[PDB]
Design a protein around this ligand. Structure first.
Ligand SMILES: *c1c(C)c(C)cc2c1nc1c(=O)[nH]c(=O)nc-1n2C[C@H](O)[C@H](O)[C@H](O)COP(=O)(O)OP(=O)(O)OC[C@H]1O[C@@H](n2cnc3c(N)ncnc32)[C@H](O)[C@@H]1O
Ligand SMILES: CC(=O)N[C@@H]1[C@@H](O)[C@H](O)[C@@H](CO)O[C@H]1O
Ligand SMILES: CC(=O)N[C@@H]1[C@@H](O)[C@H](O)[C@@H](CO)O[C@H]1O
Ligand SMILES: CC(=O)N[C@@H]1[C@@H](O)[C@H](O)[C@@H](CO)O[C@H]1O
Ligand SMILES: CC(=O)N[C@@H]1[C@@H](O)[C@H](O)[C@@H](CO)O[C@H]1O
Ligand SMILES: *[C@H]1O[C@H](CO)[C@@H](O)[C@H](O)[C@@H]1O
Length: 474
């Protein structure tokens, strides 16, 4: 039926009959498998509106595909029976030297954007650390090595061009369709088919880049306390006058934790930075560094960048929260994090691992709660803990993910108990959030109500409600 309306309009489409149905509806997380009603492949903006009319006519719900690297298979549902908007014909990358803006859309990959910007203008741009993530999907937040210095991916979106539920295609930015743009910066999937993003680009912040590892020396016998002190001390440094936003810090959460990242600088500059950080750390930890040119370092931070490499599918689950600078970790809450992650009993049939990405810095201090639908003002930490099996065709029981989830939220609850009001990270959204949880974590500070108001205005028939976490209308 939906497939017949589409065929009527001249729109290339896949339905369960089509010989390529299986390949066209394969999501990245093998644990979450939406069966959609159809996949549309519009060739221009006319076909985008014509496909949405078919869905509106039929009552079919719509979601649109980015790079198909959702940690929770969001791009295909997750509810069954949706129309999938595959924008592969609208793929583009265009750098406007007058504005410094990169314009992009369709299933454009992080690695593709970086290689273009590099060979076009020897420039960089905010991006995550997986090469095959879609730039459109990661603009729901997006944390990279330069984010302490330059903001998240979402923070650098200057405008979008959106196809709406009734076929109108509009431009939105801070000056025009401003409430829709606000909503798109955090709830894009609930609001339109976004056909174009404009992200700000940057000259590399240094010629040379020092990548580093800080870890306990091989003879140290680190306890839980030693690990806590390394985390709290890293926090102390980031909050100190010694802090540099040119230092990315991924704090690997393990019984022998370690810090890894990149300093955008060389020579004595890095040595002064590393020195003030080490002096905040347990005395048994040791620093190791290497030095590369800027572009080579990008292939280190984003492995597989230069060959635009693909990531294997995973039987996967992630839970994540942000720590706002309004409640930094205390030794007690830092302790609860370790007890529930690295020092938790191992999972019977999955590997759990993760890190605290250190956030903070000047840019985040100047993000206001209401700058976007996604509330991300003045964050200090990004906590990620995930589980995976060894192979996409190897599963772990639901009860295993339950156990892991209850442990992580024991930490979150202790953090709350300490006074903290944890936030969320859209690209690391908890697939098991209720709406109550999704609003508190992603859309706090009264953002959610304003979000519903914008939803009710721009999609009142809930065409864009393919997921239990899609924003409901009034
Ligand atoms: C590394 C790896 C290996 C994976 C699988 C994910 C990673 C990652 N590294 C990350 C990192 O360093 N930093 C991050 O912040 N996130 C990282 N992620 C997670 C990744 O950012 C997210 O999973 C993100 O959702 C990926 O986006 P995607 O490739 O576009 O995935 P989908 O195609 O499934 O879309 C995601 C979500 O957004 C909606 N969407 C996409 N494109 C849209 C347009 N044009 N208009 C409207 N809505 C759009 C999808 O419908 C879906 O809800
Ligand atoms: C070079 C170095 O850091 N050595 C330390 C040493 O001082 C300490 O006694 C031991 C116990 O943790 O760990 C190791
Ligand atoms: C001190 C440090 O971490 N150096 C790393 C080195 O281990 C690694 O082989 C190389 C390529 O990834 O990047 C650099
Ligand atoms: C205060 C300190 O240095 N370390 C504490 C330890 O004393 C305490 O047993 C544990 C649980 O509260 O949290 C950590
Ligand atoms: C063709 C059509 O109805 N277009 C409408 C537009 O006028 C309105 O601004 C927008 C927000 O409700 O929804 C769409
Ligand atoms: C999408 O459309 C298909 C074909 O009409 C249905 O079978 C499905 O249940 C969903 O409504």
């Amino acid at each position: 039926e939906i497939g017949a309306c589409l065929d009527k309009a001249g729109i290339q489409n896949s339905v369960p009959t089509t010989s390529t149905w299986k390949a066209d509806t394969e999501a990245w997380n093998s644990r979450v498998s939406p069966v959609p009603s159809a996949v549309a492949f519009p060739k221009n903006e006319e076909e985008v509106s014509a496909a949405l009319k078919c869905a509106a006519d039929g009552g079919v719900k719509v979601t649109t595909l980015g790079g198909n690297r959702s940690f929770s298979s969001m791009g295909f549902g997750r509810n069954d029976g949706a129309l999938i908007m595959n924008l592969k014909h609208l793929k583009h990358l265009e750098y406007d030297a007058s504005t410094g803006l990169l314009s992009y859309g369709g299933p454009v990959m992080i690695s593709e954007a970086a290689n273009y910007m590099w060979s076009k203008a020897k420039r960089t741009l905010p991006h995550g650390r997986c090469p095959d993530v879609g730039m459109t999907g990661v603009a729901a937040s997006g944390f990279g090595t330069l984010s302490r210095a330059s903001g998240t991916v979402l923070d650098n979106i200057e405008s979008v061009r959106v196809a709406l539920a009734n076929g109108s295609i509009v431009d939105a930015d801070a000056k025009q369709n401003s409430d829709l743009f606000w909503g798109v910066r955090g709830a894009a999937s609930s609001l339109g088919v976004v056909l174009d993003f404009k992200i700000k680009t940057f000259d590399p912040p240094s010629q040379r880049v020092t990548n580093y590892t800080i870890e306990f020396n091989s003879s140290a016998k680190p306890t839980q306390q030693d690990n806590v002190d390394a985390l709290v001390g890293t926090q102390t440094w980031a909050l100190s006058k010694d802090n540099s936003d040119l230092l990315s810090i991924r704090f690997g959460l393990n019984v022998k934790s370690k810090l890894q990242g990149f300093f955008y600088g060389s020579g004595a500059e890095a040595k002064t930075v590393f020195d003030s950080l080490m002096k905040n750390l347990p005395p048994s930890m040791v620093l190791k560094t290497n030095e590369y040119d800027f572009w080579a370092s990008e292939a280190i931070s984003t492995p597989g960048l230069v060959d635009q490499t693909l990531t294997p599918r995973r039987y996967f689950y992630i839970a994540s929260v942000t720590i706002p600078r309004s409640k930094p970790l205390t030794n007690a809450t830092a302790w609860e994090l370790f007890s529930n992650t690295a020092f938790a009993p191992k999972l019977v049939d999955a590997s759990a691992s993760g890190f605290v990405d250190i956030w903070g810095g000047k840019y985040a201090k100047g993000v206001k709660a209401d700058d976007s639908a996604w509330k991300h003002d003045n964050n200090l930490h990004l906590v990620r803990w995930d589980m995976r099996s060894s192979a996409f065709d190897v599963k772990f029981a639901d009860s295993t993910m339950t156990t892991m989830r209850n442990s992580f939220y024991k930490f979150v609850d202790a953090y709350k108990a300490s006074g903290g009001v944890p936030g969320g990270f859209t690209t690391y959204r908890d697939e098991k959030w209720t709406v109550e949880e999704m609003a508190e974590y992603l859309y706090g500070g009264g953002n959610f109500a304003k979000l519903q108001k914008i939803k009710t205005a721009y999609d009142p028939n809930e065409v864009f409600n393919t997921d239990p976490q899609a924003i409901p209308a009034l």
